Amino acid sequence: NRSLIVTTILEEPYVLFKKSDKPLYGNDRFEGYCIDLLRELSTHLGFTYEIRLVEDGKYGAQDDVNGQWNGMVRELIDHKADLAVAPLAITYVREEVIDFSKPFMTLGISILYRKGTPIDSADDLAKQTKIEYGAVEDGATMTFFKRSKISTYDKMWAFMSSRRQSVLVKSNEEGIQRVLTSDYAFLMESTTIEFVTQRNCNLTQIGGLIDSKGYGVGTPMGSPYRDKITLAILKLQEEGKLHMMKEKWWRGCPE
Amino acid sequence: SNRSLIVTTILEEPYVLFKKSDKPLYGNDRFEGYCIDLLRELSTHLGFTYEIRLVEDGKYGAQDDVNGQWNGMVRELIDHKADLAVAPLAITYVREEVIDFSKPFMTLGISILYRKGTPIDSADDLAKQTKIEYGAVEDGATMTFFKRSKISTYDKMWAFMSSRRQSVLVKSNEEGIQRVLTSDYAFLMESTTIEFVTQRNCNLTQIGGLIDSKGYGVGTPMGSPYRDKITLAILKLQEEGKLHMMKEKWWRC
Ligand SMILES: N[C@@H](CCC(=O)O)C(=O)O
Ligand SMILES: N[C@@H](CCC(=O)O)C(=O)O
Ligand SMILES: [Cl-]
Ligand SMILES: [Cl-]
Ligand code: NA
Ligand code: NA
Ligand code: NA
Ligand code: NA
């Protein structure tokens, strides 16, 4: 049967290129939590697949002037991919246009920053400008701020938008580098913060979770794979396989 | 006017309770709690009216291993005796095979409720002994997790619970709490509910961490068009901060 086209994006420890001296080809190039998830889905549901990195390098957001989506979300809308297997947040605006499986991981937006400071919350960032802050451009965190009616988050969006050329970044890796090299706090998903802080002992999460969301496998609207993948996820959960996969990929610091 | 939706639910504090009052209350006005607030928001957002009915058999729902039939709220949905189940109803593999669920409105996991002052630190410590009894709600998701599990510690625990089921499987979380308070018994309980109970009784504690991860969702019969509509409403409520506000209201040692 036809191999499913799977769109994804590079994001440690979910999706990475394998390190090797020999060139690698096709699906053999990739590893990570989401790649292990994809393999399990493929065995349980009985499909073959071809992994393709999203052409525009984006997760996906809607253009405020012309209304078009980009990123992996757009690839699904346009039926250029069968599945998006990635750390792809399930959100209201996305669920209006694509389908998602139920979540394989739960998380929330939080703050990555340096240690040893009096900053304890989003409110503390919002009320000042000396410490800059931002998010990945055209992802779910950005969109949460852009849409929020909550006073603190609306104030933060106004700042991000004003300073966007500097404070909105194209990847989590770029955001981490800004935290490490400038007076900057990065609004980042908590799952990824846990990974980063385990490996960067001078960085920490600031405050708690700002929201609650899950990552799900994306499908075009109406796809029969959506509910089948939900069932496989729920079975993998029940068996303890997702927890084992998280422990494998998240693997510390003195304290 | 459109037919009012029949909403099955179950009494479970602080999700669904009878309001305290001296005058008798009628109809929907009888009920309050997190899930009642959720239902009200869903009805306003999706434009339906409803009638709340407590599940007739008093159960969440499990499948009988001999005759293959479901019970509880799950069975009421299968049989189209209710349009929705709005309750702390766990989304599970075996249930999703036979009913549909919205995406989760709250996440949780199984954990352990026990009295303070103990060296017992985990499910492994419980499984290795028999002086302290342990159990779960009969015909709910926790019981089913143990009954199905192939993980050595949990399979051992199920063998004990099954052997002693007339004593250690209980009919409600409230009965489980009373057993913890009145005997040497540890209760396998969902974490959200433990959080509520331990804030109210400072002699009790959670033991260990979460054994699994799951969500509560609104149940619908398989194929229902309300499922995806309710998912969207829940995602919008999330994004506005209303679910966290509802949790703070009802969970407010
Ligand atoms: N996981 C996000 C990207 C990262 C972020 O927005 O923080 C998404 O699905 O858009
Ligand atoms: N919330 C559970 C009942 C309680 C439990 O099993 O711990 C259910 O949906 O079955
Ligand atoms: Cl798991
Ligand atoms: Cl769903
Ligand atoms: Na990337
Ligand atoms: Na959708
Ligand atoms: Na289902
Ligand atoms: Na004791």
UniProtKB/Swiss-Prot annotation, chain A:
The highest taxon in the source lineage is: Eukaryota
Q: Which cysteines are joined by disulfide bonds?
A: C201-C253
Q: Which residues lie on this side of the membrane: Extracellular?
A: 118-255
- Give the sugar-modified residues: N1, N202
**Where is L-glutamate bound in this sequence?**
P87, A89, R94, A140, T141, E189
Modification comment:
Sumoylation mediates kainate receptor-mediated endocytosis and regulates synaptic transmission. Sumoylation is enhanced by PIAS3 and desumoylated by SENP1. Ubiquitinated. Ubiquitination regulates the GRIK2 levels at the synapse by leading kainate receptor degradation through proteasome.
Q: How does it assemble?
A: Homotetramer and heterotetramer with GRIK5. Tetramers may be formed by the dimerization of dimers. Assembles into a kainate-gated homomeric channel that does not bind AMPA. Can form functional heteromeric receptors with GRIK4 and GRIK5. Can form functional heteromeric receptors with GRIK3. Interacts with DLG4. Interacts with NETO2. Interacts (via C-terminus) with KLHL17 (via kelch repeats); the interaction targets GRIK2 for degradation via ubiquitin-proteasome pathway.
Print the miscellaneous field: The postsynaptic actions of Glu are mediated by a variety of receptors that are named according to their selective agonists. This receptor binds domoate > kainate > quisqualate > glutamate. It does not bind AMPA without coexpression with GRIK5.
* Name this polypeptide is given: Glutamate receptor ionotropic, kainate 2
Q: State the species of origin.
A: Rattus norvegicus
Q: Which gene encodes it?
A: Grik2
Q: Which residues of the full protein are shown?
A: 430 to 806 of 908
